[PDB]
């Protein structure tokens, strides 16, 4: 694949998306536009298919009936030019090989690393920007609405949310909508309080692989509730949420030990 | 030029923008991305330069001292597959002159618009004739003057394009000459004191030469905030090309499609 | 709806590049791997590209001619209507090109491809032809040759010749089997391909893969073809080609008929 | 910052298409108009592309051959460092390639282009060379030939040979002036180009325009070059080339020196 022209054609297109990220500090990419990029990176058509089913095997906690999830820590390592699964750092809800060995999921990680690489952003004082590594915390999350966070940043450098599917979800333009604000919006606000003068744009995932990427230090955001289409049945929404930041600055530090039982490491560049 | 590869490469890119227009019902294209498109269509570098000066020769009416403008009516004719200057329809001293309409970057902008809007299915205004193979494009070259209002609306047409040519002493704060895009449920006539954030789709702000917003006028509402002066002691100006494109009035005042006898102009669309 | 498809214009852009190379070099060879995305961009379906590898199985067989099976048809590149159309037979005829070929969208893309390139290219004018016309005659042969256990250096007497490879059977590729040589105008008309002078050789080409395509200016190059050589000498070897002979009509001052075909009609736009 | 430039990756994507054609055909010929955007995409500046047409004016000149002016240098494709570097001279010498050429970003792009294509291409292994190595020796000649009012069919003894045209003066072209013929392995070593057999001819090319480039697998082709012909017979004719001879090191079972050049250091990445 290091010799495959479609690989480099895909990188060219991703470099164009990266220029737009630089300029706007966020991008929304339609899932139909992500598919050829991910294929070019090495995703198989069977793994794109399997991506739409992996959310069925997320962990169910009875103390959290409105969400099912798995999560894992990855490292974008720009010395080795690769991304690898890291050991658990504070367990039955770890991301499994089913997701992390999926080549389309791996393509998504490569996609994000390629875009965020080299992009100058606001530096959070608690983080170490002289490092050559990033920590990416990935959540595979199914939310469940049975018949509320306000405006915020996630405390990282780059956030990516990729839609995998949903069930009984209304697309009524107020359902699971991500609002994007400039920094002058009040970090507490709900929708009764958000000011139009501070709203940049409004996005809604609806189709497989719809992807939103945002500079978390330079936007604030909020996400409206999932609305059920058939109000009598449950609605679910399946997402991959990637939280990527530089390591914690030393004088609680991040462990960069690879995972022992669930190892994984894909090249970033070929 | 019908033989020039860069012409078809430009069309291919325009067709990608056209797909995004179909999906989102508007597009914003940065000036740096417009330039190679206009070149591929036939714009010379000298005419791109001259486009930044043509707004100095606009008509000045003492009746309105905050606007200097010229205007002209054009026809996108899809049976002759060309666009032509139409005669004046209500002597008149603020007609667009050859300085603009024979400029090849201006001509490229007309071709750009026609190619994107061609074939795009939209909401039909009852007072207009959508079985026609001709469109009326009313073009204003407009300099606004802020020497030391309209509210949320549609323009009454099918497609509106606003392209930035330049400005002087313009503040680039997040509220200076910003175009707000609203869904249809925003109240017509509302000013920014009452626009609801639930109904705000996007906001854009022209900033650089050839920044271009294109929108389906029957399926968005919009508003344009005032130009703010950087140095508050001096006047601020903003130079735009505003294209108002619609099907002709249904006959059942008719539009005249007689060509301009004194200022003819006709460029192929293809 | 292809008129709005970005890949249509991307294909045209690449075809315009090939056209510039044709103007410069007076011939071009395009590998089939490079032709496939161009034809797709023009409207060829992958089913029709597949079916193009079978149409040569239905060519006409005459006992008069045991080493060749063939069908042919006359087409018109009409640059007033900006389309290409099937013309009537011009001399009971049983070896006419059929809808199986001429309605194949990959074959149609091949015609559009050629018209797009040759359009506007200034060439040497044959005195017997009329270059004021807006119409070209394209005589197309679908030809299977058979070698079982010929012509020298020549021109075809037209303006542009295109030869596109569809397939073969038991053909030895490593040898100089079915090699097209092109020569400058000082090569001896009629010379056998073994006797051609290297000093007069302008190009050497060999179709080997599906949709390998040679296009040449027939008035400014001479050419010659070497025999098909069988890989296994004990068996027959076959080679399937589309051969497009395109020229301006004969000058009034026998004429070409431009009547469209009444029973096998066909017309597609050159530009969408 | 070119590592973030989309046109860099677009160039590479086209280079990899050429590489597949090279694998299939065991040679490729790239017209200069097609090379220019590739070299630009790799990092060639347009000023350096202009200056490449002048560097052959400063080649070394010796009375032993009044028909040849040249400079040369050894480079190493190092696929462990993923870089190409200038190596020290290995046999007092005054015809060394200078910084004028080797720091030219278009020349550097030509080196990158070659390593990118040849990398990983499986070829016939010369017994005298070491194909377990991760380094290649590239001997580059910048060469101006002079014709004023020899070698036959051969191999160069390397793995891959590239010839890029920089310019010419008073060169005839209608004739077979400075035509490169390629032959299969059954053509007779030492044959004069006038006496090669068409049945063993695998291609014929002729550099004509700035950056026309021929790459060939030297172990699986033979080749020959015809003399430069002057357009005006009463004047001298010149032809300016870059000739890249690339091979695996000599098997240690004279050894190639991989010490870097100390007066004329140069090292550029093959991949950004
Ligand atoms: Fe958040
Ligand atoms: Fe308006
Ligand atoms: Fe012939
Ligand atoms: Fe040689």
Coordinates of C-alpha atoms and ligand atoms in Angstrom, one line a residue, chain D residues 151 154-156 161 223 245, ligand 4:
Chain D
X151 CA 29.0 2.3 -29.1
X154 CA 24.8 -2.9 -25.0
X155 CA 23.9 -3.0 -21.3
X156 CA 25.2 -0.4 -18.9
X161 CA 19.3 3.5 -16.0
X223 CA 19.8 -0.5 -25.8
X245 CA 23.3 4.7 -13.5
Ligands
LIG4 FE1 23.9 2.8 -22.3

